[PDB]
Scaffold this active site. Sequence first.
Site, PDB file in Angstrom:
ATOM      1  N   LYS A 116       0.811  -1.215   0.000  1.00  0.00           N
ATOM      2  CA  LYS A 116       0.000   0.000   0.000  1.00  0.00           C
ATOM      3  C   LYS A 116       0.847   1.268   0.000  1.00  0.00           C
ATOM      4  O   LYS A 116       0.287   2.371  -0.043  1.00  0.00           O
ATOM      5  CB  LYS A 116      -0.981   0.047   1.182  1.00  0.00           C
ATOM      6  N   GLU A 200      -6.336  14.622   2.744  1.00  0.00           N
ATOM      7  CA  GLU A 200      -6.756  14.064   1.468  1.00  0.00           C
ATOM      8  C   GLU A 200      -8.044  14.744   1.032  1.00  0.00           C
ATOM      9  O   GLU A 200      -8.675  15.474   1.798  1.00  0.00           O
ATOM     10  CB  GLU A 200      -6.946  12.544   1.553  1.00  0.00           C
ATOM     11  N   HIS A 235     -16.980  -2.813   4.174  1.00  0.00           N
ATOM     12  CA  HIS A 235     -16.015  -3.456   3.282  1.00  0.00           C
ATOM     13  C   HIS A 235     -16.393  -4.902   2.979  1.00  0.00           C
ATOM     14  O   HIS A 235     -15.525  -5.766   2.837  1.00  0.00           O
ATOM     15  CB  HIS A 235     -14.597  -3.384   3.855  1.00  0.00           C
ATOM     16  N   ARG A 293      -5.210 -10.886  -8.507  1.00  0.00           N
ATOM     17  CA  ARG A 293      -5.821 -12.206  -8.427  1.00  0.00           C
ATOM     18  C   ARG A 293      -7.203 -12.135  -9.056  1.00  0.00           C
ATOM     19  O   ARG A 293      -7.695 -11.060  -9.408  1.00  0.00           O
ATOM     20  CB  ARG A 293      -5.918 -12.700  -6.982  1.00  0.00           C
TER      21      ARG A 293
END
Lengths: 666, 66, 88
Positions: A116, A200, A235, A293
Amino acid sequence: DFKKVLVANRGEIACRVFRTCREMNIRTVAVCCEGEPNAKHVLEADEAFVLGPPPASTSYLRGDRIICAAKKLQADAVHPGYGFLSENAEFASAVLAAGLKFVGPPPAAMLSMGSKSESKRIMEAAGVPIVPGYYGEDQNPDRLLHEAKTIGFPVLIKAVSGGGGKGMKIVMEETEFHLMLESAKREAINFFKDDRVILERYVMHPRHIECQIFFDSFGNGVFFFERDCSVQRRHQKVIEEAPAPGLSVDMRRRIGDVALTAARAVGYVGAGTVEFIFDTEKDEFFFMEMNTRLQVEHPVTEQCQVRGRPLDLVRLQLQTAMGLPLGFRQEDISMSGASVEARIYAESPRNGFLPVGGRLRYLKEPPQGNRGTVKVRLDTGFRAGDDVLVHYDPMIAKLVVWGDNRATALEGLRTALASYHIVGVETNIDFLQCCLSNPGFVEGGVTTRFIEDNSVNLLQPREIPNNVLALAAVSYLCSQRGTSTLFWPNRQISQGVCFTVGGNPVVVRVTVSTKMCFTCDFDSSSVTVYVESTTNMPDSSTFIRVTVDGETRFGFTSFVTDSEVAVALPQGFYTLALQPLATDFGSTSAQANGSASVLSPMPGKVTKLLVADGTLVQQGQAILILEAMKMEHVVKASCDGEVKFCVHADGIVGGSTLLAHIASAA
Amino acid sequence: DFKKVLVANRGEIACRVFRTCREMNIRTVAVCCEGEPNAKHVLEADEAFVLGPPPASTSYLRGDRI
Amino acid sequence: DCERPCRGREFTPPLYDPSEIGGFIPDMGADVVKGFDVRAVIARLVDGSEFDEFKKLYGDTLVCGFARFEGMLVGIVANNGILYSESA
């Protein structure tokens, strides 16, 4: 050319890979532990290898054991699926070292995109758009304010070590910044002991848009349009759609080109996904995270017509792993009607979506295949009679429906979910129906917080009319009845069935005659059900033809367990839980008094106090040992409570001598 | 858009309408009298409603009952 | 072949593993012999670990009850301590 492929992940992904290998004539090798005597993937595979003990943690994760399994069974390739151990660079390196061919990206690319931090550096150096945020080492308030002005309000302030949404402050106006920054720093210090902050750009209406890319071993790459995963909670993906509604053709082309460029920059081989945070208001997407993946949502993409033939992503992945060139390059791919995927889990939405276990005692699947107007495809890793264990792969199944338009796909998904009858495990079928019927969802694209936005509306209880109660009681009684005739002279046979409705112990009193005509009584209501005939289906269920009242004739299906009764009426599918049996039925623990002054049985010596003084002891629990005639006799507590001894140990007692007091502690 | 269609006539026409409704995903409702315990159209329909006594004349013709 | 052709083989194995029966068995050769509940043994020998005790509160040192071995009904008499007049 591969001859054997070993799948290192259980579940429905193993079954999918096995099916596509059977299509390509590749022998299938499965992986399991000692606690899997009837796993579906084990039965669907040509061979299986046990990984060792079944704690479900060491197994399916021992890379060396999987390598040994593949070598022993002469496996040619190793496919990890999308489950555990599918993103570990060390495992792929070990697979390559042993000579086996890994079905996926090179280990370097997989390792570089899992930190990350280096992944963000690579994405920045490649020119791919990045979220406009500031993460520099300078924490000066003036520099932070200047960076916030450059980024553009609204903005979000996070802690460097912040996690779980803690320490995040939303700033809408410049004036509030001087207070929000201080508050965030204080919270970060109180939670993470680090005053450093990250600024951000805050997206008020985010959408997780996924683009799927596929790259050959020769460097060629092709994108596969887009996938929308906006509808999710904490999530956890719930409902997916393809293509993403409300996206222009130019926007899709731009996203696909960006995805291909990013995959070329990272040097990717195989099938991968890139997820961006798209904003409806700003019409600009920013790279969020790439998955090296396969994904659970890949079937909704497969419903893409490569040179007219339907796409089989796993087949392409196997072909690339074999080392074969791609058939075409972004020319023989055509969009088709919209497809929608619903993820049926094993949790209870009402009680905070907590996972719950059980056994799939009845698993009537919806009609799968090419229907009149839509195509239905169900992918599951469970069969009828299997027990789903909690905290291990909570997803029960994934159901995808393809139509010509989004509305038709939604209607087909509603119909298919209505036909998915599951008895034994709580599910979220009602939650999925509420989400599908929600006006906001049917309008078009929705934000990520949609589940959190309509929580009151989506979690609405399902009403149970008295007709359902009467039919369930009648079905239960018919299940109880064998070939015996209901006859009491000059009387109607009386029966009672107790269900639990919202924790309320509802009781249905039924009077049944010799003509198989039941009358069920509710508050100021009576329902008459005449059972014309019954038929025991081979799937431990019963088909019953009934006449409700005297004018409503229809047939339905019923499934009766020892804990619930399920009815498939024309109105829908209902499961009513029987009132649970008490666990202390006929409990006689030698006493029920709150003091429990027990006396010695015979003269003897108290040898050892098995419980300390002042300790809580249950009923029938040993508290001390009495020795007489060289035989150990153990005194047990007659009731729950704190036990206090009266006689000292290593002494002597007489007949009917008090030993201890058991006082029920509050 | 229709959700339920009721066929007021028994026989093979009822079965034909039921089949074409199943093709179009319309729920089917049948009509019968008390003397029809195993009528084919009743079995092929999602629901059925009895029209009253079975003389085969008053039933299938009572418009108000239908 | 059989006086009565009835099978009656709809039985359930014991719910507890017999392999741990020895865990409940103390050392019989000892200066002071410890006592144990024989029901823990019975739970590992009979069908479905089901046992209808006859006089649960009277004998208290002789356990008498009904059980089944592969569907065959059997009366079980087991020692659970010193024999008394009530137990006899």
